[PDB]
């Protein structure tokens, strides 16, 4: 599923991501934009053998199990495939654990490099929220 911008903002808000850990909804939509281009089926293989999954590109080294990242953890206690669903519940619940881990949204390199310190409210401008 390729979400629309305002559609994803609504779904993220319904799942309680807006202002979670102090991050406004615009930060989360911006992160998803540059992590996945709003595509729940996005995947990216990393040099260390891990894989990033889903609309927020959550990594198998720490957060989900894909059976092919030797020595990894599964802190969100989910198969990584669950992170590719058109329903974003699993991704949101796992993003809540990730953003609570100590470094906030700097856990998403694309957020730090492309969203942090920008006018992130622009990503929810004009949405019926
Ligand atoms: C939360 C999450 O999956 N973060 C990843 C991190 O593993 C890494 O720095 C890179 C991998 O492509 O992009 C993302 O920031
Ligand atoms: Cl915002
Ligand atoms: Cl594994
Ligand atoms: Cl959803
Ligand atoms: Cl923080
Ligand atoms: Na894992």
Token pair for residue 78? 């989910």
Question: Which residues form the pocket of ligand 1, taking CB atoms under 6 Å from any ligand atom?
Answer: 44, 46, 52, 57-59, 98, 107-109
Distance CA 27, CA 108 (A): 11
SS3 16: coil
**Sign (positive or negative) of CA dihedral 63, 96, 15, 41:** negative
Task: Taking each helix axis as running N to C, give the angle between helix 5-14 and helix 25-36, from 0 to 180 degrees, rounded to the nearest 10.
Answer: 120
Angstrom resolution of this structure: 1.8
**SS3 breakdown of the chain: % helix, strand, coil, rounded to 5?**
40, 10, 50
Atom 9 (ligand 1): residue with closest C-alpha?
A: 109
Q: Where are the domains of the chain?
A: 1-129
Token pair for residue 10? 């609504």
> After which residues does the chain have a break in its backbone, defined as C to next N over 2.5 Å?
none
The answer to whether residue 7 is catalytic is no
Distance CA 61, CA 87 (A): 23
CATH architecture of 1-129: Orthogonal Bundle (1.10)
Gyration radius of the chain over CA positions: 14
Atom of ligand 1 nearest to the CA of 107: 1
Distance CA 117, CA 62 (A): 27
Query: Where do we find the tokens 């969203």?
Result: 115
Ligand 1 pocket mutation pick from 109, 110, 111, 114 by most atoms within 8 angstroms of CB: 109
**Chain-centre distance for alpha carbon 103:** 15
Ligand number nearest CA of 18 is: 2
Atom 11 (ligand 1): residue with closest C-alpha?
A: 46
The experimental method behind these coordinates is X-ray
Distances (CA, A) of 96 to 23, 41, 93: 11, 20, 5
Closest CA to 112 of 9, 23, 52, 4: 23
Please indicate if the annotation marks 18 as binding a ligand: no
């Amino acid at each position: 599923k390729v979400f629309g911008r305002c559609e994803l903002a609504a779904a993220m808000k319904r799942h309680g991501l807006d202002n979670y850990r102090g991050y406004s909804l615009g930060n989360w939509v911006c992160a998803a934009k540059f992590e996945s281009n709003f595509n729940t089926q996005a995947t990216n293989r990393n040099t260390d053998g891990s894989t990033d999954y889903g609309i927020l590109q959550i990594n198998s080294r720490w957060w989900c199990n894909d059976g092919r990242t030797p020595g990894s953890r599964n802190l969100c206690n989910i198969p990584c495939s669950a992170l590719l669903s058109s329903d974003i519940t699993a991704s949101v619940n796992c993003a809540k654990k990730i953003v609570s881990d100590g470094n906030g949204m700097n856990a998403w390199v694309a957020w730090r490099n492309r969203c942090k310190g920008t006018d992130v409210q622009a990503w929810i401008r004009g949405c019926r929220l």
